[PDB]
């Protein structure tokens, strides 16, 4: 138990972190043709507007919450937790609904199923699971409205990203469900560079300030 604990929360996070980075870099330099969002909308437009928007707007809400909540007087720990439970809770509901609809489509929509890759089914299934797990941790966090639980998880996270050993200790006594969510969440970073999730690196920010016409010179 103590061994599995140090593995998953002291060792594993760095393995998944190295694979996520070097894997992204390597696939970027040697796999440009494979770097795309892999849209399937044209093959079957039905329900995609609702489904994809719910999932992405929800998943992005989650991402913003997770990022500023674990990596960051006027906003004490218990206030942050209340925000996560409601704002983050709502986001996870939109996300899960969209995710489930997308998965139903991918698995049973003939044209999408016939043309999908294994990684597409695996990665989506894991995000639907991870999202469901996330929401299940809400009733558990409700039992510690003083933000005691959150403080532990945030302790761990910041220990990991700042390379301070012993990160697993911060988790002493946290409900098991939080363990699962953390492991599955890190696993997604491990598989990240070998799935369609690489599209995330390409969020088109430059477009907002780009001149409309582009012309490339002789080169």
């Amino acid at each position: 138990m103590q061994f599995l604990n140090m593995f998953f929360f002291d060792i594993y996070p760095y393995i998944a972190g190295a694979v996520f980075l070097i894997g992204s870099w390597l696939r970027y330099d040697y796999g440009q043709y494979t770097w795309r969002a892999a849209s399937s909308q044209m093959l079957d437009r039905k329900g995609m507007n609702l489904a994809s928007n719910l999932f992405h707007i929800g998943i992005l809400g989650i991402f913003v919450g997770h990022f500023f909540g674990m990596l960051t007087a006027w906003l004490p720990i218990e206030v942050k937790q209340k925000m996560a439970m409601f704002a983050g809770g709502a986001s996870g509901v939109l996300c899960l609904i969209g995710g489930v609809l997308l998965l139903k489509r991918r698995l049973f929509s003939p044209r999408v199923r016939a043309t999908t890759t294994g990684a597409d089914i695996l990665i989506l299934s894991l995000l639907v699971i991870q999202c469901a797990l996330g929401l299940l941790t809400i009733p558990f966090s409700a039992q510690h409205m003083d933000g005691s639980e959150m403080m532990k998880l945030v302790g761990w996270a910041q220990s990991v990203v700042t390379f301070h050993g012993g990160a697993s200790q911060h988790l002493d006594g946290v409900a098991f469900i939080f363990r699962l969510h953390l492991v599955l969440g890190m696993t997604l970073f491990l598989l990240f560079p070998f799935s369609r999730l690489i599209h995330i690196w390409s969020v088109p920010v430059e477009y907002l300030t780009r001149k409309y016409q582009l012309v490339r010179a002789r080169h």
Binding site: W25, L26, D29, Y30, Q32, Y33, W35, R36, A37, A38, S39, S40, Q41, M42, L43, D44, R45, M48, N49, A51, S52, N53, F55, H56, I57, P110, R111, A114, T115, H199, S202, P204, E206, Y207, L208, R210, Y212, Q213, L214, V215, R216, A217, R218, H219
Partner: protein, 508 residues
């Protein structure tokens, strides 16, 4: 004032016989792969009709092209940058595969492997190339409406029938049809380039060909909506978009495109057009859409003008290109004779593939009729194809430039007949349309005789300029996988070097 060059293309619709050879040869070379089997970079549509994809000309539905805001500025019909980004998770205007057609194949092998003692003759049934499942019935194709295949009320939904009393054309005796071969327009103000969030689409400076970088494209699939001609096709397998590449591999060395050289009808002309890139926005944003045609002509420059010549030199255009521009058949048809017109100039993209309208049999009339200003030959007023239809297609609704082109072509005919049949010089029809004998003579040389060297005047793209042709000549094609192509920085993780380069530097 920034002079740039581009090989433009003019298609004489009057000579098109609607054979589709151009479509087949392009398909064989560029789009036979799984993922783009349904894509036809070049496709021929029969008009009246809704085309491929279905109703592509309906910008209210598809949201293609540009719009001119009240403040005078240009914006993609799709929306400004924020608006476009807001539709990224699911493009609401995206044409579905069914708007094209579900690509199919047949089970030919069943004809070979049918077991002994079959109760009926074996047969090859259709199968979907998307699902791999049996198809109960083929219900669509890329040229489904070919030769008025379909009921008039269906074909008449044709967007170009706007503002026309079309009822009369459902009458057998008033029947009319024409062909519209089309490819990518390689616009001067392409909407696809402006609607791609990743900036993967660009216009090549040296020859104006517009390409989708297959490395940099991210598959945001917004460009498909952006293009008003719907000439960008999503590769459903690779997840990236592809489009006509104007056969740059051939153009680069001075050869015609595949669809140009393979055109059985001998209707396609290729020639250089010099344009002022600094005037693109000004012209595309003119207030009245009926002015876009003329505003684009004003963007084209006179290749025989020493002023343009010097500026072109200064701006880097090679000498052979300038010379090619001076004998461009495209320039003569679009600028001199005014026979060639743009395809849908109202989209505000400043298209670079133009068309000469077609002539047609005279309309049905109470009697055999009488001689007109052209004797036994037709007068522009008698043609059965409604000029307003042609105007909606080529001139934003203005019939004036369409009539001038048709009139001039008929005048040429009148003058030539006098000469070859009566053995007389009769320039009456020419003077009526503002043409000289010499101009009608040159028109005849290019349009009628149309020698190969006259239809295609394509200069080299000069791949040696600003690059190192020597090491490339020696090592290109050896695709062993050095992993160094595609970037300018020499450092690479696999600790390798470019096969087509010189790594040992001269120390002298």
């Amino acid at each position: 004032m920034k002079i740039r060059s581009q090989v433009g293309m003019v298609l004489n619709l009057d000579k098109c016989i609607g054979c589709h050879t151009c479509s087949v040869t392009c398909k064989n070379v560029w789009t036979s792969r799984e993922g783009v089997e349904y894509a036809w970079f070049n496709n021929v549509e029969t008009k009246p009709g809704q085309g491929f994809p279905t109703d592509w000309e309906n910008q209210e539905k598809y949201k293609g092209g540009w719009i001119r805001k009240i403040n005078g500025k240009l914006q993609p019909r799709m929306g400004n940058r924020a608006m476009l980004l807001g539709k990224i998770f699911a493009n609401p205007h995206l044409p579905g595969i069914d708007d094209y057609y579900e690509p199919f194949d047949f089970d030919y092998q069943n004809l070979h492997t049918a077991p002994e003692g079959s109760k009926s003759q074996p047969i090859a049934r259709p199968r979907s190339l998307i699902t791999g499942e049996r198809m109960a019935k083929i219900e669509k194709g890329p040229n489904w409406e070919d030769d008025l295949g379909g009921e008039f009320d269906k074909l008449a939904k044709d967007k170009n029938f706007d503002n026309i009393q079309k009822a009369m054309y459902s009458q057998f005796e008033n029947t009319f049809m024409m062909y519209l071969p089309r490819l990518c327009e390689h616009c001067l103000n392409p909407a696809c380039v402006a609607t791609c969030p990743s900036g993967a689409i660009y216009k090549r400076e040296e020859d104006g060909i517009v390409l989708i970088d297959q490395d940099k494209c991210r598959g945001w699939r917004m460009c498909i909506t952006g293009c008003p001609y719907k000439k960008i096709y999503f590769n459903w397998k690779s997840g990236k978009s592809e489009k006509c590449i104007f056969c740059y591999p051939r153009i680069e060395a001075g050869q015609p495109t595949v669809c140009s050289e393979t055109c059985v009808g001998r209707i396609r002309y290729l020639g250089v057009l010099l344009y002022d890139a600094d005037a693109i926005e000004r012209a595309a944003s003119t207030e009245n859409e009926k002015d876009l045609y003329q505003r684009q002509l004003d963007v084209f420059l006179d290749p025989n003008d020493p002023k343009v010549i010097e500026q072109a030199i200064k701006d880097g255009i090679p000498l052979s290109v300038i010379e090619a521009a001076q004998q461009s058949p495209v320039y003569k048809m679009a600028m001199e004779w005014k026979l060639a017109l743009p395809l849908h100039p109202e989209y505000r993209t400043l298209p670079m593939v133009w068309y000469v309208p077609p002539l047609s049999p005279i309309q049905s009339a109470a009697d055999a009729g009488e001689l007109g200003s052209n004797g036994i030959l037709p007068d522009v007023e008698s043609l059965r194809i409604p000029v307003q239809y042609l105007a909606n297609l080529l001139t934003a609704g203005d019939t004036k430039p369409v009539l001038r082109a048709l009139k001039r072509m008929l005048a040429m005919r009148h003058y030539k007949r006098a000469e070859t049949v009566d053995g007389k010089v009769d320039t009456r029809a020419l003077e009526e349309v503002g043409l000289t004998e010499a101009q009608a003579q040159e028109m005849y040389r290019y349009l009628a005789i149309a020698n190969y060297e006259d239809r295609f005047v394509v200069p080299s793209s000069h791949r040696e300029l600003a690059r190192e042709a020597f090491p490339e000549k020696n090592g290109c094609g050896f695709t062993f996988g050095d992993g160094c192509h595609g970037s300018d920085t020499k450092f690479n993780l696999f600790n390798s070097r470019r096969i087509d380069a010189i790594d040992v530097t001269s120390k002298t």
